[PDB]
Antibody, heavy 213, light 212 residues
Framework: EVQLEQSGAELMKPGASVKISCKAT????????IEWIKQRPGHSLEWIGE????????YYNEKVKGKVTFTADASSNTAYMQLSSLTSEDSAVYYC?????????WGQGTTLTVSSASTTPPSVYPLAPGQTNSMVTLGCLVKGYFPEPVTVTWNSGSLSSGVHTFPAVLQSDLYTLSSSVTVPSSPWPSETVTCNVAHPASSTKVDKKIVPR | DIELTQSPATLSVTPGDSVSLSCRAS??????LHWYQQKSHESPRLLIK???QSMSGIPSRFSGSGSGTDFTLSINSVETEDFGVYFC?????????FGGGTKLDIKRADAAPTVSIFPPSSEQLTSGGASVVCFLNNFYPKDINVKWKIDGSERQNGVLNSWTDQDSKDSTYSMSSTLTLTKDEYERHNSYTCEATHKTSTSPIVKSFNRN
């Protein structure tokens, strides 16, 4: 019944500041420390520190001192981690976790992207083929967007098997991503196959039907 | 700071194999050592607490042991769903620290990649852009090398590669390779080739098309 909810993905410029929230539900907020953990791409976990909600007691373990400040609002059962003087070294996924010696309850993670790159909507292109191989593989190219993330679905989520949505790749301040969907040859072009791309950062929702060339 | 060193850094195991992962602390931490399993894009999941104590909802196959500076996370009969990164973490000293993690993936029969190449869409072309996408799906092992060839010449500039985590269904891997060029450039060539070099074959899998 315990669950920590963190704030969403954040994009901020270097030198700027960001505040990440962590709301705890399911226990007496002020009786447990809230832990903050940093994790970079395919790297290990780094304990940033902790704060005891309702006591303002804290322990800081961040690399560059003074850039991290923890606060908590016992009134809203929410703890916060504010990162200031942001640099690229701060881009990472930050987790919140209840302090139980071990960490059993974790937040879902909040991804921070430190960059001066401007938010840009994605361009979505249908990837139509030429049973081609028992099944036929279709795809959607999602390029020129910023920042992460983008969520891709096929036929509004009705198609998940045979779907491969690849991690985006950054290039010149613009992310490019693609997703492939392998369906039986009888299903397409017989039945419609559509990829749905959403990029909240730019209030962008695109539906690109995969039509035969 | 107490440093936790995990071993091995990575390992491939076949379902049914018993596994023992190592985590060593630079100094004593008593029994204040915990284990986690983390799947890509998910927070770590607590497997074992205080060296050997169980966590509800965790398959019995997982167990932990140790005392002092040597700790072990054992998996009796590892299963396909067990792939991921395993971390140990100590709470016997401040600051709290985590091991470097052990990347565990499932060993499975070799599988050649299913390669699909896609020319630039009419839409992208209309925008003045040109991207050639190549999918190398469901292959194994993970190690693979893709190379683009335009009219016979290997192109490295403008190529973007991305790999997926190990598949939770068939333990395979997949990769996407995007060769981007200006429309003009694309229009200056005919043969676009995607070559996949995988151990499942002496000769690499090659898929191409002619702008026609």
């Amino acid at each position: 019944e315990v669950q920590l909810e963190q704030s969403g993905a954040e994009l901020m410029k270097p030198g700027a500041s960001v505040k990440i929230s962590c709301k705890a539900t399911g226990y007496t907020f002020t009786t447990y420390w809230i832990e903050w953990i940093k994790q970079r791409p395919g790297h290990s976990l780094e304990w940033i520190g902790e704060i005891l909600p309702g006591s303002d007691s804290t322990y800081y373990n961040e690399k560059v001192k003074g850039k991290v400040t923890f606060t908590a609002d016992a009134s809203s059962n929410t703890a916060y981690m504010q990162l200031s003087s942001l640099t690229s070294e701060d881009s990472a996924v930050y987790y919140c976790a209840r302090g139980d010696g071990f960490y059993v309850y974790w937040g879902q993670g909040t991804t921070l992207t430190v960059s001066s790159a401007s938010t840009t909507p994605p361009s979505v292109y249908p990837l139509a083929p030429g049973q081609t191989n028992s099944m036929v593989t279709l795809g959607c190219l999602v390029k020129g967007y910023f920042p992460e993330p983008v969520t891709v679905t096929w036929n509004s989520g009705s198609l998940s098997s045979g779907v491969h949505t690849f991690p985006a790749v950054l290039q010149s301040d613009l992310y490019t991503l693609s997703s492939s969907v392998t369906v039986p040859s009888s299903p397409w072009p017989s039945e419609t196959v559509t990829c749905n791309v959403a990029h909240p950062a730019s209030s962008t929702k695109v539906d690109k039907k995969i039509v035969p060339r | 700071d107490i440093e936790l060193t995990q071993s091995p850094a990575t390992l491939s195991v076949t379902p049914g194999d018993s596994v023992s992962l190592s985590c060593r602390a630079s100094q004593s931490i008593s029994n204040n050592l915990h284990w986690y399993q983390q799947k890509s894009h998910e927070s770590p999941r607590l497997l074992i607490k205080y060296t050997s104590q169980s966590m509800s909802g965790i398959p019995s196959r997982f167990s932990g042991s140790g005392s002092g500076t040597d700790f072990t996370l054992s998996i009796n009969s590892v299963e396909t769903e067990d792939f991921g990164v395993y971390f140990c973490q100590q709470s016997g000293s401040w600051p709290r620290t985590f091991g470097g993690g052990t990347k565990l993936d499932i060993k499975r029969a070799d599988a050649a990649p299913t390669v699909s190449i896609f020319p630039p869409s009419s839409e992208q072309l209309t925008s003045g852009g040109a991207s050639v996408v190549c999918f190398l799906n469901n292959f194994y092992p993970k190690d693979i090398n893709v190379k683009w060839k335009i009219d016979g010449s290997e192109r490295q500039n403008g190529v973007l590669n991305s790999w997926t985590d190990q598949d939770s269904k068939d333990s395979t891997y997949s990769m996407s390779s995007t060769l981007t060029l200006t429309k003009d450039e694309y229009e200056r060539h005919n043969s676009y080739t995607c070559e996949a070099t995988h151990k499942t074959s002496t000769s690499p899998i090659v898929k191409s098309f002619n702008r026609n």
